[PDB]
Amino acid sequence: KRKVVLAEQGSFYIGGRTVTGPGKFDPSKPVIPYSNEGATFYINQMYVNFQAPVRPRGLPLVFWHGGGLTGHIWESTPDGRPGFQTLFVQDRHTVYTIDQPGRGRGNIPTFNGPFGQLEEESIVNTVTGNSSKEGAWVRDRLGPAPGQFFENSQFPRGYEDNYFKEMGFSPSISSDEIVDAVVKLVTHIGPCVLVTHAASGVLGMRVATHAKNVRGIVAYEPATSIFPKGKVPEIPPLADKKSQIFPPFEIQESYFKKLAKIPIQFVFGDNIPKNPKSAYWFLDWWRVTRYAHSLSLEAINKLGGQASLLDLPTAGLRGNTAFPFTDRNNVQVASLLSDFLGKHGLDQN
C-alpha cells in the first residue's frame, strides 16, 4: 500500500555555526562573482524532514543514513518500493529523516577559493575520498566481487545504477560537529528513537550518551564499535594478517554507562562469513566488525543494559545486504523493527 495520510509534513535546518571572511561588504560593488569579503558563511548545518500521521502513537523515529548517503534511502528503494519513511508513518509513528552535515541537503562547507578553504583556514580538506561502485558493491555485500550476487541476495537486481547513484563523498567535517547537530535535533524533538545505519551507528551511540531523549536505538550494520576508554578488548586482525577493522571509539565510562539505560538492538544481514576469508576483504572485515560489536553489546549488558544482536537469518530472513531496509524483503525487516518498538513500549503514548 502506497497511500499515506499526513497530519503535517515539512523540513527545516538545524545546528551548525558561522565563519567569517575578512574585510567588509559594500552593497555598491559587484556582488557576482561572489567574494569572501565581509562574508558570513553558515557551515555544518543539518537538513531535517518530518512526516506526521494522524493520531500518532509512541515515540517519533529519527532515521539516520549511513556513510555517503542521504535520507533518500528511507524514502524509497532503488526499484521504487516504499521505504521505511512511508512504512512507519503507516505504522502511526511520526518519522524524521535527516541529511547530516556534509551530505545531501546538509551543508558542504566551501567558499570562494580551493575546496574547503576560507582564506588561510582549512575548514575541510581540499583532497576528498569517495567509494567506487566496485568498493560499495563489496562493502554492502551484494556479492563477493563487483558484478556478482550471492545466490540468496535480497538486493533489487536490475536497479544497480539507481542504487549506486544515491552514494557520494563526505567532506572532512569532524564527527563531533555531526553528533552536535543531531543532539540539537533530539533536544528539539523530545523523546525519540534513533534508527541508524553503518557509519551513523557509532554516531548514534554517541548522541544517546549526550541526550537522554534518545529512548532506544536500532542500528543496521553499524560500522564502528564503541567501548569504555581503556577497556577495548582483544580484537584480531583480518585474515590477511595485515589489516584491522575500524579503531573502536572510546568514551569515558560515565558516558558509556548511559547506553545501559535504554534498549539497543544491532541488526545484521546475511553472508557475513563465520570463518576467516582472505580472498574477500570486506567480507572478512564484516566478520571481525560484527565480532567487535558483540563484545560492545556484552559490555553494555555488564553495566545492567539491554543490548542485543539480531542476525536476520535467525529470524528467517535470508540474503539481506548491508541495507536491509531497502532490500526486497524490507517489509519483513520493518516488521521486526515494529516488534522491537512494541516490546519496549515505544509504540504507545
Place this chain on the structure above:
Amino acid sequence: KRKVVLAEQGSFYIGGRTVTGPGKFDPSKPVIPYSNEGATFYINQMYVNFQAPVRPRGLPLVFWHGGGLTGHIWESTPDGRPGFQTLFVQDRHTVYTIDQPGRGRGNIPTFNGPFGQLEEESIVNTVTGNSSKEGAWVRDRLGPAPGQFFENSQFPRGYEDNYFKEMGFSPSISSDEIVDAVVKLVTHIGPCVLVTHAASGVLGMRVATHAKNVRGIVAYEPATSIFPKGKVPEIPPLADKKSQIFPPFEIQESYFKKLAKIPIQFVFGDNIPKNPKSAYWFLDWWRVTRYAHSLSLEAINKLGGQASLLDLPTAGLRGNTAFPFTDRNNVQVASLLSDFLGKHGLDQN
C-alpha cells in the same frame, strides 16, 4: 492547512553518466581507504522526489530550485509554513521536486584526490565559489543592505538563520548536463509544467526547447535572459557604468521558436527599482535583468507565443522578495499560479 493525503510518494535518481579510474579492482586488497583503481563512478545524476494526490487533476508540476538551493524551498518556508509542494498536492496536482546535479541530493562529482579531480581529468573545478549571507541578502532583495528590510516586506523575519542555512555552493557541472537530466525526467513523466526560479529560469527555457512534454512554464525571478542567436537587443550597462547583467543565452531560432508554442509566465516580486540605483548593485542588476526579460518575452510573442510578465505588486501583492513562494504571503502567490494553470487548462484531465 497542514493535512495532506498522498496516493503515493517516493524518490529516485535519474540522469548522469559514469567515469572510470585506471586499473583493476582486487576484492582481496583493503577497500578502505577508498581508491580510484578499478573504479567506476556515477556522476552528475539528479535526485527526484514525487508526491501524488488521490485523483490528480491536470498535469504534474516540476518545481526546480534556484541557484545554490535544493527542493527544500518547495517543501517548507524558513519559518515552517507549508511550501508549494504541499499547497499543490492539496490543489490536486502530482508534484515533483528535484535536487539538480551538483546540489543537495544530486551528485557532487569528486573522487579520491583534490576536489573534482579524477587522476588527470578535471571533472569539476577544485576552486569553488559560494555566496555569503550578505551577498544573498541583497541578491534576494530582503533589503538594500544586509540587516535592512524593505518596508512592508513579506520575508519571514526572525528566520534568517533558517533561510540562509538552505543555501550553498555548486560545483562547475556544465549547464548542458543539468539540462540533460531534466529533459530525461520530463521524458519519464510525460506532459508536465515546469516551475522554475532564478538560476533555473534559463535552464527550464532550454529544457522546453528540447522536450515537447513541457506544456507550460512559470518562472519566478529568472536570472538569465534568452534570445535567438544573433538577435540579442541592446541592453544597457548598470548604473555603476562598469557592470553588466548576465550575458543572455542565445539559441538557434528553430529551438527558440518552440517557446512560442506553450504558455510562459515570468513572475517578479517587489522593490525592483524603476530608475538607475548606483548605490545598490543588485537592485540595479534586477532592474536591467527584468528589462532584458521583457524583451525576451516580446521576442517570444512576435513569433506567435503566449508569454507574459507578472509583477506581483500589480496583482495587489506588495513586499515580496525574490523567493515569493516562501514569503509570508505565499498562499496568495500560489493562488496566482493556480490561476495561470486554470487559464490554460493545465489543471484539467
